[PDB]
Design an enzyme around this catalytic site. Sequence first.
Site, PDB file in Angstrom:
ATOM      1  N   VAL A 275     -48.190  32.625 -15.909  1.00 37.48           N
ATOM      2  CA  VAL A 275     -49.450  32.171 -15.268  1.00 37.48           C
ATOM      3  C   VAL A 275     -50.603  32.130 -16.298  1.00 37.48           C
ATOM      4  O   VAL A 275     -51.491  31.245 -16.225  1.00 37.48           O
ATOM      5  CB  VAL A 275     -49.822  32.957 -13.955  1.00 37.48           C
ATOM      6  CG1 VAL A 275     -51.214  32.537 -13.388  1.00 37.48           C
ATOM      7  CG2 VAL A 275     -48.748  32.771 -12.883  1.00 37.48           C
ATOM      8  N   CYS A 276     -50.554  33.054 -17.270  1.00 37.74           N
ATOM      9  CA  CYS A 276     -51.644  33.263 -18.232  1.00 37.74           C
ATOM     10  C   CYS A 276     -52.194  32.023 -18.986  1.00 37.74           C
ATOM     11  O   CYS A 276     -53.415  31.857 -19.044  1.00 37.74           O
ATOM     12  CB  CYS A 276     -51.254  34.341 -19.236  1.00 37.74           C
ATOM     13  SG  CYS A 276     -50.581  35.840 -18.498  1.00 37.74           S
TER      14      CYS A 276
END
EC number: 1.11.1.24
Lengths: 195, 195, 195, 195, 195, 195, 195, 195, 195, 195
Positions: free
Chosen positions: A50-51
């Site tokens: 997700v980062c």
Amino acid sequence: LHLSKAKISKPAPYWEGTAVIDGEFKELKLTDYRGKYLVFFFYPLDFTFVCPTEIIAFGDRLEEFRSINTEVVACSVDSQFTHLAWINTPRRQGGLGPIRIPLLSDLTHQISKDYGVYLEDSGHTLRGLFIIDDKGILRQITLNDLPVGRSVDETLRLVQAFQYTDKHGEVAPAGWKPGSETIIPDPAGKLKYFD
Amino acid sequence: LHLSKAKISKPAPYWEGTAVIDGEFKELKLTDYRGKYLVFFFYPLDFTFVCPTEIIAFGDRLEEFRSINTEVVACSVDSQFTHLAWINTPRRQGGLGPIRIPLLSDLTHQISKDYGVYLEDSGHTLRGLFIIDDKGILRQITLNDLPVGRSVDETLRLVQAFQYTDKHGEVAPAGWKPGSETIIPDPAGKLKYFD
Amino acid sequence: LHLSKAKISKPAPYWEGTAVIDGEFKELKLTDYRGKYLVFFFYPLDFTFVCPTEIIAFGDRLEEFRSINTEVVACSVDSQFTHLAWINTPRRQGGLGPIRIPLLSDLTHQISKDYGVYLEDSGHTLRGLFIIDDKGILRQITLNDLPVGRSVDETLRLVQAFQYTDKHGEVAPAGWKPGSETIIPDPAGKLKYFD
Amino acid sequence: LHLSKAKISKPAPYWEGTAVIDGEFKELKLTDYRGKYLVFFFYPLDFTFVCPTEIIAFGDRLEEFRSINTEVVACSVDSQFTHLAWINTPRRQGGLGPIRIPLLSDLTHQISKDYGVYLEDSGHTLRGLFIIDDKGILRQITLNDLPVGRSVDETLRLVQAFQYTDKHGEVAPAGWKPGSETIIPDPAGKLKYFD
Amino acid sequence: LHLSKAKISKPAPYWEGTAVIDGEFKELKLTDYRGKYLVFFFYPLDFTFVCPTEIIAFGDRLEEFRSINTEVVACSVDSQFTHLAWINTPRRQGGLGPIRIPLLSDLTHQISKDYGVYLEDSGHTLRGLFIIDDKGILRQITLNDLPVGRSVDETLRLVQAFQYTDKHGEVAPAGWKPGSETIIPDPAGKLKYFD
Amino acid sequence: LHLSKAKISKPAPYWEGTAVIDGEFKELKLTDYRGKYLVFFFYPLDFTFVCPTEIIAFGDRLEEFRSINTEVVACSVDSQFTHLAWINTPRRQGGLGPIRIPLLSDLTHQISKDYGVYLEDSGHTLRGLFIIDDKGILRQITLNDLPVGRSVDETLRLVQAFQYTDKHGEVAPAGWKPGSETIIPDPAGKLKYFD
Amino acid sequence: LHLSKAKISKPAPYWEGTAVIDGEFKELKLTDYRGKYLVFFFYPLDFTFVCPTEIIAFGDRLEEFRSINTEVVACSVDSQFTHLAWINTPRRQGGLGPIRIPLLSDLTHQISKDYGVYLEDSGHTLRGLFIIDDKGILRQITLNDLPVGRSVDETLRLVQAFQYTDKHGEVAPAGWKPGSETIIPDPAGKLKYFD
Amino acid sequence: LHLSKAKISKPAPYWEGTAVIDGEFKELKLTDYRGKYLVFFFYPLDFTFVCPTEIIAFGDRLEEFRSINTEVVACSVDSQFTHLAWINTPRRQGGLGPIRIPLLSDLTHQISKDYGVYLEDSGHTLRGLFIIDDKGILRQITLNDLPVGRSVDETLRLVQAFQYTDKHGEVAPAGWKPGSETIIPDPAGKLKYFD
Amino acid sequence: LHLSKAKISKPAPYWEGTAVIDGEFKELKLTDYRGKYLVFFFYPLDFTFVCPTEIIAFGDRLEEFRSINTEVVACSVDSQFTHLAWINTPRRQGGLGPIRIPLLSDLTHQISKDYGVYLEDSGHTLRGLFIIDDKGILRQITLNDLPVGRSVDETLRLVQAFQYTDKHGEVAPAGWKPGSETIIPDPAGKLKYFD
Amino acid sequence: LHLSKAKISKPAPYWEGTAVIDGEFKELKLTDYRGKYLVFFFYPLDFTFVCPTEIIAFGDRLEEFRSINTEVVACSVDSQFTHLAWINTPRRQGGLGPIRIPLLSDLTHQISKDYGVYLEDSGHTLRGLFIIDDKGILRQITLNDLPVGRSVDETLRLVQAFQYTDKHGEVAPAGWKPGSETIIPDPAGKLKYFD
């Protein structure tokens, strides 16, 4: 029992460290942003999942913050050397590519612990975002569990609302956007709105 | 130093108290909601300003949560007697009118302190919202300073994303809505998404 | 163990907070009353049962206190916003109607704990009345369990007796009312009363 | 800080001592009164001023309590021997004369200190009165500074009020006496009283 | 473990309080006796049995003390009002009658405890007598269990003995009375006595 | 602060050690005296001044104690070898000569410290005397500063008075001797004596 | 654990007290001996067994110490009065007769405890001897159990050896006596002695 | 404050370690000597000055100990390898030469500290000798400052004296040698010696 | 003070964590290595300077360890995701390229602190190498400041020497390599080496 | 837990002691070496096995260090006297012979414990070597278990590496020796080395 120095309506806890800024290592500190709003957010790990999408979402929309006197800084527990390598990795490989947001390194974990976002069992942070005003005061805290990213749209709406209410000393109802009705925080003055 | 029992990815702190539910006093507790997602949110004070707009926004959209197996509970430090009086005050007078969301009373302030939302200098809470999953685990925390309300749209998007990622064991990128692309949290599987 | 700072014959514990006075929010302080006797009483909760009858009884008989240089202040743990709403509720509905006694808000519970009247398990006070003299010294403490109201007549009798004994340095026998026999507090002089 | 074991709504602190009862020394215990209401009251000193009038006032009206299943016991730090001398002293010399009320002796001060009425600077109690129900629970505390006596009428009104509210579970308004209107402690049922 | 401040050879512990002196309440202090010997004695309780006999035995023989520059003070835990009522009780009824010896009141128990004569289980003192010299130094301590009175003759003997040894720096053999042989406190000088 | 284990009306502190008895060294214990009264007394030092006269005064009159079932034991900090040397020294050289009272040795000081008679700055005892009953309960304590000796007459009077009041349950007035009136310790009974 | 202040090569623990010197009582201090060696020794008890023979052995040979600038002092827990009695007792009765060594009295036990020779279970010292130099530094410690006495020859040999090594800065072999070879305390110098 | 476990009259502190015994390393323990007297002595350092003279003086006279059932053990802080190299150094060079006495190594310092002979400022022991009986009880302690050696003659004298007093239960006067008069430890029996 | 659990000749501190092995994430534990020697080394940070050269040097020479029953594990505070990314970076760019040594991740810093190599001010380790034998016992610790790399040749020499001395119980002189002289650890046997 | 004062990158812990230098005893201090690199090394015991080979190895190659401005000092818990004996022992008997390296003595163990090399169970050090720079900062720590000696070559390589990196601020790769390629510690400049 959870412990943090981060308290809403109090000065945001001070931080300083090395950031990667336009491909270079630079000393960065919370107070470099006095006079401007700051969206300061943590993400778990370079080279993960997700980062990069969150860093890229904010990065690609940075001028929307910069035009309302607001800066963005992202932070993880990785080193500045790892941050630089991730930046020099193509977006197609889950890399960041070139990026206009500073990436701050919290290798000692002190900044994470201070903001109450460190996961002791994992050794990195969860998804914690902090809105800090031009006076260094903490206004908003959003913490997400690992699997679910944040919203640039929602962060923008929050920054706008805090700056509006800063300026006019009225209060912003649920869902408020620019152009929306506000409330005079008086038991007589509030009736304007509620009619 | 800020203290709370509320930790993301841990069981939400247990609570119980008196709520007003469809015009009546009833015992309510956190575990009554096991098996369902719960949006549990605090607001500062009955008979004030941003507070009724948020209760009404969630209340008027309650079927949007109930159809994704999600309940909503609001809480302030006021008594159940004050909650009832506010409900029996017309919306035009800044009242709530009839409402389908339970209003929980935290008169001893213990629940507020446990969730880390109590303001010691004011004697009430700030605007703190908590998303808790069907297993009683805390997934998301949103805290706003007093002047700025929350977003039902954003809460919905978060609940949807947590339930999606619960089910499929992939992760939701920044800004994810139903129908949006997700990521396989594998350094090989992630490349599907990033191409 | 039960603890309090309120000790008979010592200065009454200082308090300050927001009160509703004449339908407006004012800072009020114990020291605003120096020079006058003060009946300072706590009641459990706005919008309840015995509580309005007691506030109304003191309000409707205020002149009987003011004509003997005594003021009256009521206090609960409710917010000033709930106080104002209760005042704007008609008496037929259990409201107060307009009222000439300040309603002090003790939302943090500091004042209630200082006076030893806070109930830890319920989050509000019991029925505690305090008579404070013009020098700020505490003279009398009356505490009732929840279901039984206090007496304006008994309070007035006590105020008058403390005033008469302050002035004359005689002492007041059981059931003394203005016009009754007093006693000279001396082993020889007492004989004038007892024969 | 002021400390005490006496808390309204909790078992009255246990006591035992020597009392003078109908001219004789007898061991007396708080638990001797289970099954009956008890007016338990402390007075400063034998052979003083207000003290004999309060004991006589209750003494002469004893059947008024005894016919509503209520007993009365008085206590001071004086010895049983001094209590008996005082009883054997003619009323006309500030003596008591015969009395039907037990005079309990608290020479060690443990009872006084338990009830929070002991004056460390003076070595005797202030005027503290306690109404204890038939279950041994403390219902009412009245503390007077030295110069001002207590009221039999008012004590009687309170005993009747607690007994009425025990038996009918309605609540007693300010000033309530037998034959007065009571309130049903429910937000709907209350309106019968208020309207 | 038994504790007290009273040590032979050291200044007697300071005391001050209210005494009945010729029918009047007066503040009396230990230092009021500097320049004179003092026999300072405690007795358990006013209106009891051995106690009046001792107080009367020292009172009636007071000139035997005053003519050797010695004063006598009696003390109990009773109030000064009880001491005065006891004095106003005829000897035939176990009273004191008028008395020339001050009666000190130790209601708070502080003086008794400083002198190590307070009985925690009973709330009064045992029979403790203290001989204090003109320089304020404690010379002698006599403590009797409750059932047995002290001796004015023995007390006189001890005062006379301490005054003689003070003046002549010789020492007083067992049973010494005025006119008796004393001893030069010296391994050579002593032979004058033993030979 | 002065500390001791010796308290009137409590068991006398246990002691044991070596005494000289009829010129021989023998193990002696407080419990050897159970069933009889004991006069236990300390004197400062062998080969000194008041010390021999007291021991001789008791020794010469020992049959007056024995015939009332009372024993006498003397104690100092000196060794048993010193006790024996002193006994073997003629009375005319301040020596004891033969003697029928045990001389207990308290070389370790434990016995002196237990009885509160030890003088830390001198390394020996003051003149303290103790009367212990047949049950081992301490009844009387007499402490003299160094220059002044005790009295066999007064000691005999006390033992006789304790034994009389032990037997008849009446109490002994100031100066009571065998044949004097005693008092019934009762508010009515006492009037026999006083009238 | 055994505790003491006496340590070789550190200043000997300060002492002061009353000694018998040529039949008189005199104040003696460790510091009185500065500028000369001192043999300071403890013995258990006056009027005992090994004790007189040791004192006599040193006393009879005192000029052998004096002529090497060394003094001798003896000490026990006995009083100075006991010391004097023992001196006035003929040698043929285990007494000392006249003697030219001070007998120091350690009645309080402080000196014994400082030197680590005190026997808590017996209340006197073992046989300990100390050699202290002209600077007040402890040089030698000899402790014997009770049954076995010390040696004047060995003590003289040690004092002579300390004084010799103090003067020449060489060191003294096992069994050195005046006239024996000494060793230069140097890896080369030592070879003079050993070769 | 000087501390040690070694007390006269009590079991000598246990020890165990590596000794050089006839050129070999062996584990040696204190309990190996039960049933025999032991002279256990410390010396500062191998390859020094006084030390070899003492070790050699006891070694060369070992039969004077063994023929009275006494063993000798020497100890220093040096390693067993240093002890062995010292032994393999010729006497003429300050070495030991072969030796019949075990040399115990106390490298960790534990044994020295248990015996109270360790010098914290120097990192080795002083000259401390200990005589321990066949039952393992410490009888004698001799401690010398560094510059002065001990005496084998004195040590023998003490062993012989302790063995004689053990066997015959009489006591040994100052300077006692075999064939010398002893004392019956009795105030009567002693006269056989003194007369 | 510096603290660590890593002590030479004691069991190496247990560790477990995620490693990259063959490009995959595996749990790895210290106990997986029982039966083999282990070279366990920490390096500061992925994507830096000296660090790749050391990892590559050990990797490229792995057979030299494996052919003598020794394994190699490298550890930094970086995540397993950063390790994998570094492995996928070509050596020309300062990456590792594929590697046959596990890369253990110490993201929580637990392992680094247990081994005493964590730098508190920097948030990463220094250059710490540990040689652990087949029984899990720690044999060797090499710590270098940041700017200077370690030596594969020196590590191999040490491993071989510990293996040779484990097997033969001889000891290894300075600079020993296979084929060199060893020493028998005996004072007699050592002479074979030294002549 | 293992404790030490020695930390890489901090001032090496201060030490002072007696050393043997060119056959003589001299006070030696760590601060004597300011301005020069120092190889400071501990070895277990004089007269043992690996220890002489390590001292000889460094001794015979001393000018190799002395010509790169580096000094060498060795230390064990042995005394200066033992160190000197060992020096005077022929190399052919495991002796040292003359050596130019100071042998510092750590008899008290304080230096060993400060450097974390002391073995509490054994009473001597393991093989610990420390490289300290000309500023007094600790750069390198090498600890070997007892059986395995250290390497002069490797120590020399490390000294050269620290000196090179001090002076040129490049960093030294694994295995670096004089004339080897170094690395510029910058993400761009590093590529000159890696490519």
